[PDB]
Amino acid sequence: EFSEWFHNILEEAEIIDQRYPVKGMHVWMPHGFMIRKNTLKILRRILDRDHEEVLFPLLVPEDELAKEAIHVKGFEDEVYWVTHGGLSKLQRKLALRPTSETVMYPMFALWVRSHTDLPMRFYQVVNTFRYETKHTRPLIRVREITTFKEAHTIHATASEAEEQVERAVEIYKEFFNSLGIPYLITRRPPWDKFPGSEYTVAFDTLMPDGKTLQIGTVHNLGQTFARTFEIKFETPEGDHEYVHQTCYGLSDRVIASVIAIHGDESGLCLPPDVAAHQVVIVPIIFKKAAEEVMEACRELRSRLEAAGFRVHLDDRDIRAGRKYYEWEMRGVPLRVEIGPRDLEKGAAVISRRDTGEKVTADLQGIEETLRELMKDILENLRTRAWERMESEIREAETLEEASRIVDEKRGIISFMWCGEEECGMDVEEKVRVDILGIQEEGSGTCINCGREAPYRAYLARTY
Amino acid sequence: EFSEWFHNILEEAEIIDQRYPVKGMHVWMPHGFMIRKNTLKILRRILDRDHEEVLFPLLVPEDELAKEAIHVKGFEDEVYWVTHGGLSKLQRKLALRPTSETVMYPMFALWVRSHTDLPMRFYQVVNTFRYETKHTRPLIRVREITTFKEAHTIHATASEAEEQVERAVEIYKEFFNSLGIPYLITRRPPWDKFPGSEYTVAFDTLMPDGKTLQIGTVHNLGQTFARTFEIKFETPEGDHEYVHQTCYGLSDRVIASVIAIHGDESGLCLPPDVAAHQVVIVPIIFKKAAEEVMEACRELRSRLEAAGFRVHLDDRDIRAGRKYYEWEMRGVPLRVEIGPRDLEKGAAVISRRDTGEKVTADLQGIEETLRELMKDILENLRTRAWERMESEIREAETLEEASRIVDEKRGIISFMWCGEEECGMDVEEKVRVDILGIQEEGSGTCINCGREAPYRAYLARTY
Numbered sequence: 073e074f075s076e077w078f079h080n081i082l083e084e085a086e087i088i089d090q091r092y093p094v095k096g097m098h099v100w101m102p103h104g105f106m107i108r109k110n111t112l113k114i115l116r117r118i119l120d121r122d123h124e125e126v127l128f129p130l131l132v133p134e135d136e137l138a139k140e141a142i143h144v145k146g147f148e149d150e151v152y153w154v155t156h157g158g159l160s161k162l163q164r165k166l167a168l169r170p171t172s173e174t175v176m177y178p179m180f181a182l183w184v185r186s187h188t189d190l191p192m193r194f195y196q197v198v199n200t201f202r203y204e205t206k207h208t209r210p211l212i213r214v215r216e217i218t219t220f221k222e223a224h225t226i227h228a229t230a231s232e233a234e235e236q237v238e239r240a241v242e243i244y245k246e247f248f249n250s251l252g253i254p255y256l257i258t259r260r261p262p263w264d265k266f267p268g269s270e271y272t273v274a275f276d277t278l279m280p281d282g283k284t285l286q287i288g289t290v291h292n293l294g295q296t297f298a299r300t301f302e303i304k305f306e307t308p309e310g311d312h313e314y315v316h317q318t319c320y321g322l323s324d325r326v327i328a329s330v331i332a333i334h335g336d337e338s339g340l341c342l343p344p345d346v347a348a349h350q351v352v353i354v355p356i357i358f359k360k361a362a363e364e365v366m367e368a369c370r371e372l373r374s375r376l377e378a379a380g381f382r383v384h385l386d387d388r389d390i391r392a393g394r395k396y397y398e399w400e401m402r403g404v405p406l407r408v409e410i411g412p413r414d415l416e417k418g419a420a421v422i423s424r425r426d427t428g429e430k431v432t433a434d435l436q437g438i439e440e441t442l443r444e445l446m447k448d449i450l451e452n453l454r455t456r457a458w459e460r461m462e463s464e465i466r467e468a469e470t471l472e473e474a475s476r477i478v479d480e481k482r483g484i485i486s487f488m489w490c491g492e493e494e495c496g497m498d499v500e501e502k503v504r505v506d507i508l509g510i511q512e513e514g515s516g517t518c519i520n521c522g523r524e525a526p527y528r529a530y531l532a533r534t535y
Numbered sequence: 536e537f538s539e540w541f542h543n544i545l546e547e548a549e550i551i552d553q554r555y556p557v558k559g560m561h562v563w564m565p566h567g568f569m570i571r572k573n574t575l576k577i578l579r580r581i582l583d584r585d586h587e588e589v590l591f592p593l594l595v596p597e598d599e600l601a602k603e604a605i606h607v608k609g610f611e612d613e614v615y616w617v618t619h620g621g622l623s624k625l626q627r628k629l630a631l632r633p634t635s636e637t638v639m640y641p642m643f644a645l646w647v648r649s650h651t652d653l654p655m656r657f658y659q660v661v662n663t664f665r666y667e668t669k670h671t672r673p674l675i676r677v678r679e680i681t682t683f684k685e686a687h688t689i690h691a692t693a694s695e696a697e698e699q700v701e702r703a704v705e706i707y708k709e710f711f712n713s714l715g716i717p718y719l720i721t722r723r724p725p726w727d728k729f730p731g732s733e734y735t736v737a738f739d740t741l742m743p744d745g746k747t748l749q750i751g752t753v754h755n756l757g758q759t760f761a762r763t764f765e766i767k768f769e770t771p772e773g774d775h776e777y778v779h780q781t782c783y784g785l786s787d788r789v790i791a792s793v794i795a796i797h798g799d800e801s802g803l804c805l806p807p808d809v810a811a812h813q814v815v816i817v818p819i820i821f822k823k824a825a826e827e828v829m830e831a832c833r834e835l836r837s838r839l840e841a842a843g844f845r846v847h848l849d850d851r852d853i854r855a856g857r858k859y860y861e862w863e864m865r866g867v868p869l870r871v872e873i874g875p876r877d878l879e880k881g882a883a884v885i886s887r888r889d890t891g892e893k894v895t896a897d898l899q900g901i902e903e904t905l906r907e908l909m910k911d912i913l914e915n916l917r918t919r920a921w922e923r924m925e926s927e928i929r930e931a932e933t934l935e936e937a938s939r940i941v942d943e944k945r946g947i948i949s950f951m952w953c954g955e956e957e958c959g960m961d962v963e964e965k966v967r968v969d970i971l972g973i974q975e976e977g978s979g980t981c982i983n984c985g986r987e988a989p990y991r992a993y994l995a996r997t998y
């Protein structure tokens with residue numbers, strides 16, 4: 073049911089067009105692009121406080137790519153290779169970046185010299201490529217991740233790296249809270265961690281179909297990469313030690329989830345700061361004081377633009393009904409309607425998208441009325457969102473009880489686990505599910521092997 | 536001399552790092568990225584008035600790519616090819632986009648149906664790839680054009696297309712005028728036009744080394760592409776005619792030229808709206824009322840931020856001299872200095888980057904003082920720039936006189952030309968130069984063959 077809804081809204085709302093001749097590569101249409109744009113504005117406000125945006129190349133030579141032990145093994149046959157430059161075959165294969173460690177790190181080796189240089193915090197929003205699963209899904213599992221934001225940091229001590237991991241987590245929390253997206257934070261199992269990292273922390277959110285979606289990862293790379301690419305720095309004493317690195321990223325999934333989670337029957341419902349328009353003015357006219365209604369709307373639009381609003385005056389010549397439907401299925405938060413009546417009273421009708429509540433406000437101080445409504449809409453959407461997710465995280469004491477809950481109610485399943493490979497693998501195989509990760513807490517007994525369970529773990533059917 | 540200057544400033548000002556293992560692919564460092572960012576902000580303000588930003592894929596399948604007669608011939612061996620997806624060879628070669636006609640047009644065939652749909656105006660800023668000349672030059676001739684802005688339009692009548700070409704030209708004029716970049720507009724010879732177009736209009740600017748740089752092109756594609764990809768539309772009568780298309784683009788060259796043209800001995804000099812910082816506050820202190828000087832600067836910074844300025848308070852602990860040098864070689868327009876004296880008077884020293892003129896202003900209304908200075912700096916830079924270019928465009932009546940001027944003074948050479956292939960080719964071969972394009976005007980006699988010359992043409996040594 074959700075799948076169909078999603079695919080249809082992506083088309084109706086004109087977000088992406090999937091009819092491109094190459095599987096897993098979609099087109100961002102005007103409207104979709106605007107949402108993506110606003111989502112990135114929000115992200116960058118946060119990231120630009122302490123990160124420096126850069127932009128590295130797309131192509132990586134075998135030499136550099138296969139320079140890592142496990143990392144290269146991790147993306148072995150998941151990499152696209154350019155072999156020819158025109159008719160002639162390149163004397164050195166070039167891979168489209170799957171992620172940029174092998175692109176930036178050799179360069180980091182040069183930029184880093186003294187401890188005065190550290191810490192360094194960079195990020196870029198580029199397009200990456202991954203040749204994976206025959207199962208292609210819009211914004212969720214694409215071959216061309218068109219909105220891959222990857223941040224990479226460099227530190228003097230391992231201590232600072234761990235500290236950075238904590239900061240990244242807080243940055244994502246804030247990012248997501250701004251999109252009203254709920255999340256579960258866990259430490260992925262050591263066999264699912266980013267190829268070559270010390271450990272991976274992941275953010276997972278729940279899709280309306282009971283399936284889970286990884287919407288963010290933070291990795292503590294320790295110094296394994298530093299040693300590989302020779303990223304050393306001079307200490308205040310005169311010694312030469314390797315650096316401690318971390319990296320974290322998000323993809324188009326963040327947009328998929330903002331669409332999916334605040335999804336609706338009427339179409340899209342979006343956080344005010346993400347919608348293409350925050351306020352759409354719709355004039356109601358039947359050839360009766362029209363000239364005065366129109367000039368009341370125009371006055372209003374200009375007044376809102378100057379106030380900092382992303383407003384749109386829909387003066388098209390169609391029935392107000394159709395207009396309502398359109399801007400509603402497109403996710404516009406507030407609709408301001410103006411008719412002869414209310415006009416001859418100095419007021420207008422303001423309709424919310426999340427609730428449907430129409431109120432009456434004085435065009436005189438409407439700016440503040442709108443700002444407040446917007447703050448309200450996000451809080452509501454974020455709240456609802458959190459309730460819906462938590463109400464889907466259920467505890468299980470028996471491995472059999474887990475199977476019953478997953479298969480019947482879907483959602484996330486909480487449980488105490490010993491934290492052993494074989495036991496975890498067995499759990500996954502038996503329940504045909506995936507262990508998202510752990511969260512350290514009081515002990516107990518592993519739901520599967522009964523041994524001492526140091527971790528609170530979660531599992532679910534994932535994307 | 537210029538070459539060395541350019542390369543050194545790109546490094547000193549930390550714009551791009553060329554030390555990447557793959558020739559023709561450079562890295563945008565933090566500072567460079569900020570300039571690129573601001574340059575694009577300026578561009579988008581203009582383009583977003585009547586264009587809709589989109590984002591298409593990077594990869595194009597042979598099927599689509601080689602679907603055009605001349606277009607495919609034009610980028611035959613200039614295209615990079617991905618042949619393998621992991622270890623397995625793709626059953627369909629994929630080319631990195633050189634430009635996106637073959638990527639978007641098949642998709643345009645679907646989006647276009649009724650005349651009510653037209654006109655459509657799109658654009659995107661993506662990275663494109665071109666395997667060309669062994670001669671790689673930073674921001675001027677790269678394999679990965681990291682800042683390729685391509686706009687594509689669709690029209691019902693050929694008349695509107697030509698009209699669009701005129702609009703594009705005006706858009707670029709405004710873009711460039713904002714960067715204070717001077718330009719010569721001409722109609723490229725029919726053998727240099729964009730592969731498959733009806734005709735190409737190009738913008739050329741002059742580099743400090745007397746060489747010319749193409750910084751923008753507009754193409755009228757007529758309906759040749761429409762027929763190729765089947766982009767038809769229903770007329771108000773019920774007929775099905777093809778569409779009229781145009782497309783135009785810019786690359787990183789725009790940034791190269793803003794750096795080069797307003798170049799300087801002290802380093803970078805940039806239009807206020809392009810610099811990473813428009814105002815850098817430098818407090819002068821020698822342990823004498825410091826606490827009061829610092830709090831005067833902080834107060835000022837905040838005050839400027841809230842006014843809309845991109846300001847930076849350099850409170851580092853180094854000699855004010857070094858600070859001056861740094862922000863000067865980096866292109867910061869205005870430097871605001873505050874010391875005990877001026878402070879105890881309610882004034883500060885404002886230094887211009889283009890001139891070096893230091894003035895004294897009341898911290899009380901400094902906001903306006905700064906805004907005015909910024910407007911002034913651009914006008915000055917744009918003016919100077921235009922003078923320098925025009926003073927390098929020289930007329931020639933004899934083909935021999937041309938050779939003397941080019942070889943001795945470089946620059947651009949104006950001349951009357953018959954407009955024939957063979958004559959033009961001959962001119963180029965004999966003068967070892969390139970014919971930029973023509974400009975229709977009163978007749979005369981071709982500088983080479985003496986026949987009737989309908990066109991005013993220009994030539995020069997180019998990049």
Ligand SMILES: Nc1ncnc2c1ncn2[C@@H]1O[C@H](COS(=O)(=O)NC(=O)[C@@H](N)CS)[C@@H](O)[C@H]1O
Binds near residue numbers: 213221223322
């Ligand atoms: N095929 C895909 N389609 C869409 N999003 C994806 C895809 N693969 C991964 N992602 C998203 O991108 C994020 C980062 O991917 S990753 O492999 O975990 N980590 C990185 O690549 C690290 N180098 C951090 S920059 C994931 O958390 C996930 O939300």
Ligand SMILES: Nc1ncnc2c1ncn2[C@@H]1O[C@H](COS(=O)(=O)NC(=O)[C@@H](N)CS)[C@@H](O)[C@H]1O
Binds near residue numbers: 680685686750751788
């Ligand atoms: N290798 C290159 N490096 C940097 N800039 C380039 C390169 N090749 C072309 N350009 C710049 O990019 C602009 C557009 O390139 S073009 O081939 O003339 N035209 C297009 O590709 C058309 N499809 C318009 S979008 C040129 O005007 C030129 O200024």
Ligand SMILES: [Mg+2]
Binds near residue numbers: 264500506507
């Ligand atoms: Mg697993």
Ligand SMILES: [Mg+2]
Binds near residue numbers: 727969970
């Ligand atoms: Mg030529």
Ligand SMILES: [Zn+2]
Binds near residue numbers: 489491518519520522
């Ligand atoms: Zn166990």
Ligand SMILES: [Zn+2]
Binds near residue numbers: 953954958985986
């Ligand atoms: Zn001639």
